[PDB]
Write a protein that binds this DNA or RNA. Structure first.
Length: 48
DNA sequence: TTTTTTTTTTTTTTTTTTTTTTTTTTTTTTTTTTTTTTTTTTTTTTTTTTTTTTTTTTTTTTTTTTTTTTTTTTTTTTTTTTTTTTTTTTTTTTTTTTTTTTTTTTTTTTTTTTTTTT
């Protein structure tokens, strides 16, 4: 369960993951996202 | 009772190999330096009515040099073949899940002994 929050003051967008699937480790999920960002397999991510 | 044959581990130290300490080259990483975006206000630029004298298009006619034109022979175009690259099925390998089998390490505290350095 995630939403693309859109700022009102500026046009920048931030994705917020409210919930996570079952039997998924959050630390490994964040590490995998960081690995994809470093390898440029997923584009558009600014921060994490 | 004396004397004779044979067997191996040691005096071994040297040759071969292995193990363990080393430091050149392409791939990371922190720094400074240059591209981007948002506000203030500011003289400055720029949008929109009115008048005006202008200078280019439309009555009409003229020609000549680009539009007609036909035809020879080139030469770009197309065909077949083969190589190089791109891209996707296929396979392999690895990781995570939850109950099982196995293990392995770092320090305090005192007192006494080995074990090196001066």
């Amino acid at each position: 369960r995630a939403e693309v929050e859109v700022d009102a003051k500026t046009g920048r967008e931030t994705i917020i993951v409210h919930e996570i699937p079952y039997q998924v480790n959050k630390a490994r999920l964040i590490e995998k996202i960081a690995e994809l960002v470093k390898e440029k397999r997923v584009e558009g991510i600014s921060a994490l």
